[PDB]
Amino acid sequence: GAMGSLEARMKQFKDMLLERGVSAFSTWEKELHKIVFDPRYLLLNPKERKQVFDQYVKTRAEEERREKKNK
Secondary structure, three states: OOOOOHHHHHHHHHHHHHHHOOOOOOOOOHHHHHHHOOHHHHOOOOOHHHHHHHHHHHHHHHHHHHHHOOO
């Protein structure tokens, strides 16, 4: 219903990624502890969660890279 059903959940996830910084260039496991410390890490299933990761690391990296590699 225009951002409110699943999108919201998948949004609370994307946000969390930008909260602890799911390093757009690291291992999903290191990134685990980073977020898993929260129960919202268990929101999307291994399907919707898989996209949120590859999609986040893809767009985020391209940006933080072209700028100054961030780190």
